[PDB]
Amino acid sequence: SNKTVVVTTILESPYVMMKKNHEMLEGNERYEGYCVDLAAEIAKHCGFKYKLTIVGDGKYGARDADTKIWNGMVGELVYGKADIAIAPLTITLVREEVIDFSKPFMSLGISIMIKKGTPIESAEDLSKQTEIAYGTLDSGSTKEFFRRSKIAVFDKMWTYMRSAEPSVFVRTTAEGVARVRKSKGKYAYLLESTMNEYIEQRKPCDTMKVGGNLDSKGYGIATPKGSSLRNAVNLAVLKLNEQGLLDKLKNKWWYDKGECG
Amino acid sequence: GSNKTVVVTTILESPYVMMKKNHEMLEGNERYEGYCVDLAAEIAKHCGFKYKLTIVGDGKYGARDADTKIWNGMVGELVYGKADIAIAPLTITLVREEVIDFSKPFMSLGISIMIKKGTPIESAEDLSKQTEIAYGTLDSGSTKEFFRRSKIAVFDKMWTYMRSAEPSVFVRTTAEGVARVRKSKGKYAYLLESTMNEYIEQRKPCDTMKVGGNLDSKGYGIATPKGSSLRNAVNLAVLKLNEQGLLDKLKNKWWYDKGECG
Ligand SMILES: CC1=CN2CCS(=O)(=O)N=C2C(c2ccc(OC3CCCCC3)cc2)=N1
Ligand SMILES: N[C@@H](CCC(=O)O)C(=O)O
Numbered sequence: 150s151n152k153t154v155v156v157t158t159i160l161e162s163p164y165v166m167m168k169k170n171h172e173m174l175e176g177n178e179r180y181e182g183y184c185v186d187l188a189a190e191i192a193k194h195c196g197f198k199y200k201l202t203i204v205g206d207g208k209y210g211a212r213d214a215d216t217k218i219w220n221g222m223v224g225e226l227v228y229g230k231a232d233i234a235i236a237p238l239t240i241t242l243v244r245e246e247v248i249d250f251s252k253p254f255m256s257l258g259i260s261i262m263i264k265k266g267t268p269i270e271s272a273e274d275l276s277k278q279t280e281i282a283y284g285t286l287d288s289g290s291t292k293e294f295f296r297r298s299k300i301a302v303f304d305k306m307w308t309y310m311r312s313a314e315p316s317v318f319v320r321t322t323a324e325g326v327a328r329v330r331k332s333k334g335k336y337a338y339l340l341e342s343t344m345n346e347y348i349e350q351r352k353p354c355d356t357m358k359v360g361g362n363l364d365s366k367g368y369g370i371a372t373p374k375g376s377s378l379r380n381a382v383n384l385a386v387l388k389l390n391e392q393g394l395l396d397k398l399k400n401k402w403w404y405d406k407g408e409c410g
Numbered sequence: 411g412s413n414k415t416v417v418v419t420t421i422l423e424s425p426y427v428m429m430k431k432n433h434e435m436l437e438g439n440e441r442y443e444g445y446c447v448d449l450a451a452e453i454a455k456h457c458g459f460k461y462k463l464t465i466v467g468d469g470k471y472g473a474r475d476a477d478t479k480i481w482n483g484m485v486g487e488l489v490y491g492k493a494d495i496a497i498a499p500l501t502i503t504l505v506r507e508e509v510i511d512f513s514k515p516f517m518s519l520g521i522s523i524m525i526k527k528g529t530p531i532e533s534a535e536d537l538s539k540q541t542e543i544a545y546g547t548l549d550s551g552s553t554k555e556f557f558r559r560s561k562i563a564v565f566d567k568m569w570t571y572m573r574s575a576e577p578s579v580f581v582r583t584t585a586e587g588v589a590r591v592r593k594s595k596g597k598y599a600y601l602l603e604s605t606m607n608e609y610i611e612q613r614k615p616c617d618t619m620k621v622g623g624n625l626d627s628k629g630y631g632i633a634t635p636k637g638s639s640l641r642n643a644v645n646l647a648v649l650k651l652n653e654q655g656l657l658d659k660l661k662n663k664w665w666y667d668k669g670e671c672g
C-alpha cells in the first residue's frame with residue numbers, strides 16, 4: 150500500500166539549491182537543481198510520491214573507523230531514516246557493501262581547482278612543493294581516495310594533507326571553493342570534476358580546473374538493502390539516459406547556467 | 411553443490427579478445443589475449459572461481475528478434491543457459507538489463523564517428539546535412555538500436571537515411587566497418603563506440619580518426635543471468651578493481667602503451 154518515499158539529498162550546487170523565493174514556498178517546491186529534476190523523473194517513472202529532505206548532518210557518508218557508525222546520506226539509508234538518496238553520491242566499494250546503487254547517472258573524476266594564475270598544472274606539481282596548501286572535503290569519497298591510494302604521488306599528497314596545519318580539510322564544497330578564492334593562490338582544492346566545472350562557469354569567474362582527472366567513476370541513486378524500489382529505480386536511470394534526459398539536465402544546470410561567457 | 415568451472419562467453423573483438431599468434435600450440439584459456447582476457451582472470455581470482463573462456467557461437471553481441479522474441483549473441487548465451495557470465499565489451503542497455511544483470515560499468519564509452527583522415531565532417535549534424543558521404547553502424551548491437559530508437563531530430567534523420575540506404579550501410583563486424591572507411595576514399599564514415607574508435611586511431615596505417623563529441627554516454631558491464639550466485643561478488647570485484655587502478659592500467663596496456671601511431 151503506497152506510502153510517500155522519503156528522499157535524502159544534500160545542498161550542493163547545482164544538484165539541489167534553495168530557490169531565490171524559497172521562504173514563500175513549501176515542501177518540494179522550495180528546491181531546484183539537477184537532482185530535484187532527476188527525483189521528479191525517477192518518481193514519475195517508478196510511480197511514487199516523495200518528500201525531499203536535506204541530510205541532517207550535511208555529509209555524504211563515511212564510516213567511523215572506531216565505532217563503525219555511518220554518517221551522512223549513507224547513514225540515513227542504513228539506519229532507516231530515509232528510503233532513497235538522490236544526490237551526487239559517488240559509487241564506491243565500501244558503500245556498495247552496505248547500500249545498493251543504481252547504474253550511474255553521471256560520470257566524474259577527482260580534479261584540481263586553483264585560483265586563476267596559480268602555478269600548478271597537476272597533482273604531481275602539488276606534491277612537489279609546499280608553498281601552496283591543498284585539501285579535500287571531509288566525510289566523502291575524495292578524502293577516502295587519498296587515504297587509500299598506493300600511487301606514489303597521491304600517497305605523498307595524503308601524507309601531507311593528513312598532518313597539515315592548519316587543517317586543509319573542509320566541511321562543505323562551498324567552504325573549499327571560498328578558501329581557494331580568498332587564498333591569493335596559496336590554496337588549491339581537490340574535488341569532483343562535476344562540481345569543479347560548474348564553479349568554473351560561475352561569477353566571479355576566478356577559478357579553474359587544471360590537469361587531468363585522477364580517477365573515473367560515477368554517481369548513483371542509493372537505496373537501503375532489501376528496498377522494493379531497487380529494480381524500478383535502476384531501470385528508470387537507464388531509461389532516462391537512453392531518452393537523452395540526463396544529457397538534457399546536465400546541459401540545463403551546467404552550460405545553460407554559464408555566467409563566464 | 412560441488413565447485414564447477416564457470417563458462418565465460420566473450421567475443422573476438424580487438425583489443426578485448428584476440429587469438430594469440432601461437433594459439434594452435436596452446437590450450438584452453440591460454441589461446442586468447444586482450445583486455446577482457448586479463449579482466450576475466452582478475453574477476454575470477456577476486457571472486458574465487460575457475461573458468462573457461464568461450465567465443466560466442468554466432469559472433470554477435472545480443473539483440474532480441476522482433477518476431478520470434480529470441481535473443482542472439484552473448485545475451486542469448488546467458489538467457490538460454492549456455493554460459494554463466496559474459497566478460498566482453500557488452501553495452502549496458504535498458505532492454506538487456508530487463509533480461510540479464512550487469513555489474514557496475516568497467517569502462518566508459520559513447521557512440522562516436524570514425525572518418526578517413528581529411529573527410530570534411532566534424533559532427534553528427536554534419537553527416538545528417540549531406541549525402542555525398544555514406545555512413546552506417548554494426549548491423550546488430552547497441553549502436554544500431556540507439557539510432558532505431560532515437561527521438562532526437564539529428565539522430566532520427568540519420569536513422570531514416572541509414573535504414574533505407576542501398577547498398578546496405580550496415581556491417582557484420584567492427585573490422586568490416588573499419589575496412590570500409592579505409593577503402594572508401596573519404597566517402598564512408600562509421601558510427602561505433604568511442605573505445606573501439608580510439609583503439610583503431612592508434613593502429614597502422616594511422617589513416618582514421620575520431621571526430622566530434624560522443625553522441626551519448628554509457629558503459630560496458632559484466633553480465634550474468636538473473637538469479638546468478640555470482641552477481642554480488644562480480645559487482646564488488648569491478649568496484650575494487652577500479653579503485654585499485656587496475657582498469658585504467660589495462661586500458662593503457664591494450665590501447666596506448668603499444669599504440670603504433672606515435
Ligand atoms: C552519464 C552516464 C550514463 N551511464 C548510464 C548507465 S551506465 O552504467 O552504462 N554508465 C553510464 C555512465 C558511466 C558513468 C560512470 C562510469 O564509471 C566507470 C568508468 C570506468 C572505470 C569504472 C567506472 C561508467 C559509465 N555515465
Ligand atoms: N560525491 C562525493 C562527495 C564529494 C567529494 O568527496 O569530493 C561523495 O559521494 O562522497
Ligand SMILES: N[C@@H](CCC(=O)O)C(=O)O
Nearest residue numbers: 471499500501551552553
Ligand atoms: N558494445 C555494443 C556492440 C558495438 C556497437 O554496437 O557499436 C553492444 O554491446 O551491442
Ligand SMILES: [Zn+2]
Nearest residue numbers: 190193194394
Ligand atoms: Zn521521463
